[PDB]
Amino acid sequence: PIVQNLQGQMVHQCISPRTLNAWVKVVEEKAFSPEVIPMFAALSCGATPQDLNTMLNTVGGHQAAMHMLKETINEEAAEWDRLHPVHAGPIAPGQMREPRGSDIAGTTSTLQEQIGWMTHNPPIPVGEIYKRWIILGLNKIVRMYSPTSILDIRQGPKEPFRDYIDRFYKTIRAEQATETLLVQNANPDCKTILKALGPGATLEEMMTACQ
Amino acid sequence: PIVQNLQGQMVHQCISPRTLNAWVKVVEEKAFSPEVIPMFAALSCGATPQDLNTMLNTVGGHQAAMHMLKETINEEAAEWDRLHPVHAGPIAPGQMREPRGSDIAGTTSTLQEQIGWMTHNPPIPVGEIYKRWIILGLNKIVRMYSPTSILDIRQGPKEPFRDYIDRFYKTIRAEQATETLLVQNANPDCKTILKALGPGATLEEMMTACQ
Amino acid sequence: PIVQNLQGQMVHQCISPRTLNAWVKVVEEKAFSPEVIPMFAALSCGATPQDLNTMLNTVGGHQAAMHMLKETINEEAAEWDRLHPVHAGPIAPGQMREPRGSDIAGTTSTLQEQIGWMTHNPPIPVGEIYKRWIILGLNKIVRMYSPTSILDIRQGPKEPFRDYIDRFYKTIRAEQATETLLVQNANPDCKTILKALGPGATLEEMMTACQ
Amino acid sequence: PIVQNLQGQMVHQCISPRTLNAWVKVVEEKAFSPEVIPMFAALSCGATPQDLNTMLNTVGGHQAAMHMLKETINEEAAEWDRLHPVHAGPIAPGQMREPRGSDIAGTTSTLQEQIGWMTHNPPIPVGEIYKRWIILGLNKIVRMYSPTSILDIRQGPKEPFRDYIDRFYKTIRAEQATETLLVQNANPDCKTILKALGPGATLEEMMTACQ
Amino acid sequence: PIVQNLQGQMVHQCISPRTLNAWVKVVEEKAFSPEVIPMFAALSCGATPQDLNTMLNTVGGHQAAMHMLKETINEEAAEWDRLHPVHAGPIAPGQMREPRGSDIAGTTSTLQEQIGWMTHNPPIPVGEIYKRWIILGLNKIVRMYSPTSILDIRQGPKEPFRDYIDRFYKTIRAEQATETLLVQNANPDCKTILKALGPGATLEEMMTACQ
Amino acid sequence: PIVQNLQGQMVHQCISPRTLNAWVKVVEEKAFSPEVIPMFAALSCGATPQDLNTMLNTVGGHQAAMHMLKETINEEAAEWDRLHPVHAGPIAPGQMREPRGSDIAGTTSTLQEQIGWMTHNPPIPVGEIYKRWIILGLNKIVRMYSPTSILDIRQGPKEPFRDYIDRFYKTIRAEQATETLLVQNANPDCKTILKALGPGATLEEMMTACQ
C-alpha cells in the first residue's frame, strides 16, 4: 500500500503477511457473508491496484465468484474508457501517462506507474477507483450467494423473538448488499402483541414486548 | 485512526489487522456482556468515523442489535443537527465545511473531511463525538441482552458466598450499563451472619464472615 | 500509555490489542494468583489513568473482587484529597488545574488533562499514583482469594520434599501479598533429617538432604 | 528485502520470521494450488535474490518440483547470458560489475553486490528479474500438479450448479497457469435451461437460471 | 529495557507483552532444563533491574526455586556491598548516588535511578550486573533439578547409539550448569566397536562406527 | 543483531522473541532435515556471535549433535588462529584488538567488542565468519542424521512416480548437504517408459511420461 512515513510523506510499503493471511482466512471462514466486504475494504486500506489483485488472487476457493468479479471489473473498466478516453501515440519523454481502465485494474500498469498516479499532485487515486469497482462486484456476489428470501424468514412457534429478528436482519443485509414484514412474519402469539403496540414502534420496543 | 508520528504530528494510519480481528473475536466470544464496551472504546482509540463504521460493520452476527444501534445513532445525529444547524448553499472555495450529524456518523463524509476536522485547530473531534453516540447505543444493547433481574440473583443453600456475590455484581453491571439487597438475597445461614455484622460493613468484611 | 518517541519526547500512544488481550487472558487463566500483580504492573507500564481503567474494566468475571477494588481506590482517593486539598472556584484561563483523587483515578479527568499532568515539568505522575492504589487493592484481593493457611501446608508421607516446599512457598506468597515452620510441617522421615542439619541451614541444603 | 526507511531511502532489511513462516506454511497447506503463486509474489515483495533463495530453500517437501524449478531457473539464466554478455577480465577498482545469470539467481553474487545493483541509479532490478524466472518455473509446476483435465469436470446429476462451476473454474485456473464447454459439461436438466438462455449469457445469468 | 532509538540514543522502553509471555511460557514448558537460562538471557537483553524482577516475579510455579534464587541474589548483593561501600549521609543536590547491592537488585532503587546509572557516562551497568547474579542463581537451580547422575546414563541393549549419546550429553549439560565414560557406559556390542577405534576418536567417528 | 536504523546507521538491536521462538520451534519440528539450515541462516540475519550462541544454546534436545557442532567450531577457530595470528601483550589504550578464533565464536569476546568489529571501517564481519563455521558444522550433522542411502530409494510397484521422485530428491539433498540412478531405481513399468525417452530428458519430461 501507500502510507505516510514518520517524516510525513507518501511512500509505498509492502503488503504485510498479517494482512495477506487475514484476508485469506476471512474468505475461508465466512465465504461471502455480507460482513466480508467491510473487512476487505479495511484490510485494503491504502492499497495499490497490485495489492488489490494480490488479495483477490490469493483466494483459492470460490473460483466461479472470482470469475464473476472479473466480469464486473471489466464492465467498470470499459465504462471508465468511455468516459475518459486516453490519447494514443508516444508519451512525452519522462512524463506521466493517463490511466486506462486496465491500468486502474492493475493488469496493464506497473507498480511504479500506480505509485506515480496515487502520489501525484493532484493524485489520480487508482487504488480507490479500483476498490470501488471490486466492491460493486463483491456486493453482487453477496446477493447471489444469499441463501434465503426475506419472505421465508418466519418466526417458529417456539423460537425466541430475539433469535427470529437476528435471522431477519441478517437476511435483509444479505439480500440488499421492514418493521411491517417483521410483524407479518412473527408467530401468532408475538404478532398479537406487536399489533397491540401500534404504528411507529421501535425495534427496541418490539423486542421488550415479545420478550 | 489518527496518531502522532515519530516526529510529533497528527496523521492518519490504517486500522490494523490485529485491531480488526480483536474486535470481531470479542463480539464472537462475549456477545454483549458489559465488558465488551470498554474493549470497544480501547480498540477504537483515535478512530475516525470511517474506522468506527468498519468495526461495527465487520460484525456478522447480532444484526437485530446492530439495527437497534443504527437507530440510536440516527437519534443522536438528529439531536446534533438541532443543536448545531449548518448553513446551506455553496461552500467557500478550499475551505472546511461544518459537519452535520450524518458527517459525524461517517455516512455522508469522506475520510479526507474526517481527517480535516479531527486535525484542525481547534479540532472538531468527530471520532470522539461519534464514539460517544455508539457507546450510548451499545449500553442500551447490553441492558437489553441482560438475561436476569438482580431480584432473581439469590444465594443457593450450598453455593459459596464468593460465587453468589460474583453473580450478583455481574448482574448489577449488566442491568445498569446494593449491600442491603445482597444481604436480603443471601441464604439463611449467611444472612444471619451478615445481619450480626451490622450496618456500614464493607463487601470485604462480609466475604470474610460468610467464608 | 505515555512513551518516548524516536525523536526523544513524551507522547501518548494507544493501548495495544496485544496488551489488552494479554491482561484479559492472564485474569482468565490465573484469576488472582499472586503472580498476576507483577504481570499487571508490567502490562500497564507508562499507563494513563484511562488506560488503567480500561484494563480493569475489560475484565468480565470476578465482579465481587472488582467491586472490592473500587472500594480500596475510593479510600485512597479520599486520603489523597485530605493530604492535597485543591482550591475551589474558576481555574486560571489556559492553566493546568490540580488533580483531585477522582482525577487521579480517571473518573473526573479527561485524557488530555491526564497527559498534561504526566508530561508536565515537573510531572504530576497520576498514572503511577493510581497504579499504586490499584496494586494495594489487588494485593488485598490476592490475600482474600488465598485458599489455604500456611498452617495447613504439610508434607505427605509419600510426597517428595521438592513438591512440598513448592506448595509451602506458593502459599506463603499468596498469604502475605519460615524455615522453622517448614521443618515443623515436614513429614516424620524428612523432619528427622532436617533436625540433624542444625540451625542456619539454607533451603538449598535442606532440599539436598531430604532428596 | 530492500525497503524505503522513515527518512525516505532504499536500504536492506532482514527477511522477517513472519514472512519465512508464512511461506513455509502456505506450501505445507496448499502444495502447488494456483493461488500459491500470488502469495509467493506478495511475500517476496522487495526481495533480493538471496531472500528468494531463502524462501525456496526453506521448503522441505516437494523436492522433485524444487529440482524442476532449478532447471527452469538455469534455462532463464542461460538466456540472460546470451542476451547480455559480460566482458571478462579484471573489474575496475571500486566499480560495479555487470550481473550474469547466476548473479541474478543469487548463486555467484554476494548480498552486497545484490544491494548495489538494486539500489543503483539506474537500478539493475536483479530481485524482480529473478522473481520473474521463479514464477515462470512455479507456473509450470502448478500445471504439472493439476490433477484433472477440464474435459473431466462434469456436473453430477444431483450436484448444485454453484458447486460444479467452482470445480470448473478451479480446474481452468490450474490447467492454464469457456462458457460453451461449461454448458456442454453441465447435467441434462441444467443444460436444457442454459441452452434456452441463448448466446452471450454471463456466468451470473447462468447461475441464476440453474439455481 | 534500555534501547537505542532511531536517532541513536539510549532510552527506556516498556517490556513487551511478547517478551513477558515468552518467558512465562518457557518456564511453564521447560521448568529448569538447562536451555531455559540462555532463553532468559536473550529475553532480558537490555533489561533494567525492574525488568529482571518483573520477569522473575511473573513466574507462578516453582516457588521453592524462586526462594532459593532470592538467597543467591542476597549473597551476591552482600558481596557487592563489601567490595563497593557507599558513603552514608545526604546526597549532593541533583547528583547521581552510588548503587548498593539492593539498588542493583531493584528492591531499593527506582526506575529513574536505574536508567540514570545505565545511561551514565561512563555507565554503571546495573542491569548486566544483576543479570549475572540471577544467572548464577539459575545455574544452581538447574543443577539442583537435574534428575539423573551421568553415572546412571547407560546405553540399553536395544537402544540406538544416537539416542544414548543424546541422553548422555543432555545429562552432562544439566549436571554441570567425557568420551571415556561415554564408552564405559555404552552397551557390550557398541563398547567393543568403540574400543577398537582407539584413543582420540571424535564423537562423529564414534557415532558412525556404532550406527 | 546489527541493523540499519531509520536514519541510516549500523546499530545493535536485541534478538526478538519471534526470532528466538521460530528457531527453537523449527528444530523441534524438523530436527536436522536439510531445510533447517537455510532457516537458520535467515533467522540469524545480521547476527552477532552472541546472537548465534543464543540460538544454538536455546536448543534443548539433540545434545550429541550440539556437541559435534562445538567440535567443528573449535576446528575452524584453530584454523583461523593459524592463518591470522594475533600479537600478544598489552593493547594500545582505547584501540580495537584483533579477534582470535574464540573471539569470533563469542566465547572470549564481549558484545561491545563484537559490535566494534562488525561496525568498524573496514568491518571485521565476525558474525558472518562465525555463521559460516556453524553452517559447516550443521551440514555435517544433516549428513550424519540422513536416514537412507540414495541406493535404497527405489520406486514401489504401486508407488506413483511423483511420490518416488520426491523421496529420491529429498534423500539426495540430505545425503550431500542423478537422472541415470533415478531411472535405474524406478519400477519395471516406469523404467521401460523412461528408457524409451532416450538421453537428455528433463525431469519434467520423465514425470509426464510415467504419469
Which of D192, D195, D181 lies closest to D151, judged by CA?
Answer: D181
| Structural contact between residues A13 and A2, judged by C-beta atoms closer than 8 angstroms | yes
Cα F44 to Cα F61: distance, rounded to the nearest angstrom = 20
Q: Which domain-ending residue is among A149, A164, A186?
A: A149
Cα D42 to Cα D63: distance, rounded to the nearest angstrom = 23
Maximal C-alpha separation, chain C:
77
Q: What share of chain A is helix, strand, coil (3-state, %, to 5)?
A: 60, 5, 35
Cα F20 to Cα F34: distance, rounded to the nearest angstrom = 20
Q: Which three cell numbers mark F177?
A: 548437504
The CATH number of residue F167's host domain is 1.10.1200.30
The CATH number of residue C49's host domain is 1.10.375.10
Q: Which residues contact C15 (CB under 8 A, 6 or more apart)?
A: B42, B45, C1, C47, C51, C54, C55
Cα F168 to Cα F161: distance, rounded to the nearest angstrom = 10
Is C41 near chain E, with CB under 8 Å? yes
The CA-atom distances, in angstroms, between B100 and each of B66, B130, D31 are 22, 11, 53
Q: Same domain for E155 and E141? A: no
Q: Same domain for D118 and D209? A: no
Give the closest-approach CA distance of C42 to chain E in angstroms: 7
* B164: Cα separation from own chain's centroid: 26
| Omega prior to A199 cis, within 30 of 0 | no
Q: Which residue on chain C is closest to B162 by alpha carbon?
A: C64
Cα E4 to Cα E46: distance, rounded to the nearest angstrom = 10
Is F28 near chain D, with CB under 8 Å? no
Maximal C-alpha separation, chain E:
77
Classified as helix, coil or strand, B39 is helix
Classified as helix, coil or strand, C29 is helix
Q: Which three cell numbers mark E1?
A: 529495557
Cα C155 to Cα D184: distance, rounded to the nearest angstrom = 81
Residue A2 phi, psi dihedral angles, 5° rounding: -105, 125
Is E149 near chain C, with CB under 8 Å? no
Q: Same domain for C69 and C138? A: yes
Q: Same domain for D96 and D198? A: no
Q: Is A88 exposed, middle or buried (0-12, 13-18, 19+ CB in 10 A)?
A: exposed
Classified as helix, coil or strand, C175 is helix
Nearest CB to F60 within list E30, E42, E208? E30
Cα F114 to Cα F98: distance, rounded to the nearest angstrom = 11
Is C7 near chain E, with CB under 8 Å? yes
Q: Same domain for C141 and C156? A: no
Q: Which residues of D touch A177 (CB under 8 A)?
A: none
Nearest CB to A21 within list D16, D22, D203? D22
* Cβ separation F166–D61 shorter than 8 A: yes
Nearest CB to B169 within list C63, C140, C144? C63
What 8-state DSSP symbol labels residue E147?
Answer: -
Number of domains in chain B: 2
* Long-range Cβ contact pairs of E167-172 (< 8 A, separation 24 or more): E168/F63, E168/F64, E169/F63, E169/F64, E169/F66, E169/F67, E170/F61, E170/F63, E171/E146, E172/F63
Residue A4 belongs to what H/E stretch?
Answer: strand A2-4
Q: Which three cell numbers mark C204?
A: 538449598
Q: Same domain for F105 and F173? A: no
Q: Is B122 exposed, middle or buried (0-12, 13-18, 19+ CB in 10 A)?
A: exposed
Which of B182, B32, B170, B209 lies closest to C64, judged by CA?
Answer: B170
Q: Same domain for F135 and F51? A: yes
Length of chain D: 211
The CA-atom distances, in angstroms, between E68 and each of C148, D167, E64 are 22, 65, 6
Classified as helix, coil or strand, D165 is helix
Q: Same domain for E171 and E161? A: yes
* Cβ separation A20–D16 shorter than 8 A: no
Range of the domain at B142: 1-149
Residue B2 belongs to what H/E stretch?
Answer: strand B2-4
Cα A104 to Cα A133: distance, rounded to the nearest angstrom = 10
Cα A130 to Cα A114: distance, rounded to the nearest angstrom = 11
Q: Same domain for D125 and D35? A: yes
Q: Which residues contact A61 (CB under 8 A, 6 or more apart)?
A: A27, A28, D166, D170
Q: Can you spell out the DSSP letters for F59-119? A: --S-HHHHHHHHHHHHHHHHHHHHHS----SPPPTT-PPPPPHHHHTTSS--HHHHHHHHH
Q: Same domain for D184 and D142? A: no
Is D22 near chain F, with CB under 8 Å? no
What 8-state DSSP symbol labels residue C96?
Answer: P
Cα C195 to Cα C193: distance, rounded to the nearest angstrom = 5
Number of neighbours of residue C152 by Cβ within 10 angstroms: 9
Count Cβ neighbours within 10 Å for each residue of E32-69 and write b for 16 or more, e otherwise. bbbbbbbbbbbbbbbbbbbbbbbbbbbbbebbbbbbbb
Give the CA count within 13 Å in the CB-facing half-sphere of F9. Answer: 8
Cα B94 to Cα E113: distance, rounded to the nearest angstrom = 53
What 8-state DSSP symbol labels residue C3?
Answer: E
Q: Which domain-ending residue is among D129, D149, D169?
A: D149
Cα E78 to Cα C191: distance, rounded to the nearest angstrom = 31
Is A64 near chain D, with CB under 8 Å? yes
Cα C168 to Cα C165: distance, rounded to the nearest angstrom = 5
Is B78 near chain A, with CB under 8 Å? no
Residue in the structure block whose three cell numbers are 557507599: E86
- Orientation angle between helical segments C188-197 and C203-210, nearest 10 degrees: 130
Cα E159 to Cα E190: distance, rounded to the nearest angstrom = 10
Is F111 near chain E, with CB under 8 Å? no
What experiment produced this structure?
A: X-ray
What 3 state SS string does C135-167 have? HHHHHHHHHHHCCCCHHHCCCCCCCCHHHHHHH
Q: Which domain-ending residue is among E129, E149, E169?
A: E149
Maximal C-alpha separation, chain D:
77
* Cβ separation A68–D203 shorter than 8 A: yes
Classified as helix, coil or strand, C26 is helix
Residue D12 belongs to what H/E stretch?
Answer: strand D10-12
Residue C10 belongs to what H/E stretch?
Answer: strand C10-12
Give the closest-approach CA distance of B80 to chain A in angstroms: 20
Is C181 near chain E, with CB under 8 Å? no
Cα B174 to Cα B34: distance, rounded to the nearest angstrom = 6
Query: Which of A3, A23, A39 to mutate to test binding with chain B, by most B CBs within 10 Å of its CB?
Result: A39
Give the CA count within 13 Å in the CB-facing half-sphere of E160. Answer: 9
Which of A96, A114, A116 lies closest to A105, judged by CA?
Answer: A114
| Structural contact between residues A175 and A143, judged by C-beta atoms closer than 8 angstroms | yes
Is F144 near chain E, with CB under 8 Å? yes
* Long-range Cβ contact pairs of B121-126 (< 8 A, separation 24 or more): B124/B99, B126/B48, B126/B49, B126/B99
| Structural contact between residues E165 and E156, judged by C-beta atoms closer than 8 angstroms | no
Q: Same domain for D198 and D181? A: yes
Give the closest-approach CA distance of B146 to chain C in angstroms: 14
| Structural contact between residues B37 and B131, judged by C-beta atoms closer than 8 angstroms | no
Is D117 near chain A, with CB under 8 Å? no
Number of neighbours of residue F10 by Cβ within 10 angstroms: 14
Cα F80 to Cα A126: distance, rounded to the nearest angstrom = 57
Nearest CB to A166 within list B63, B71, B140? B63
Q: Which residue on chain A is closest to B141 by alpha carbon?
A: A204
Which of C147, D135, F103, C3 lies closest to E14, judged by CA?
Answer: C3
Q: Same domain for A120 and A192? A: no
Q: Which residue on chain F is closest to D50 by alpha carbon?
A: F42
| Structural contact between residues B32 and B65, judged by C-beta atoms closer than 8 angstroms | yes
What 8-state DSSP symbol labels residue B15?
Answer: P
Which of D6, D22, D104, D92 lies closest to D58, judged by CA?
Answer: D22
Cα C114 to Cα B41: distance, rounded to the nearest angstrom = 17
Chains that touch C (3 or more CB pairs under 8 A): B, E
Which of A185, A184, A179, A181 lies closest to A206, judged by CA?
Answer: A179
Classified as helix, coil or strand, C14 is coil
Which of C125, C175, C122, C127 lies closest to C153, judged by CA?
Answer: C175
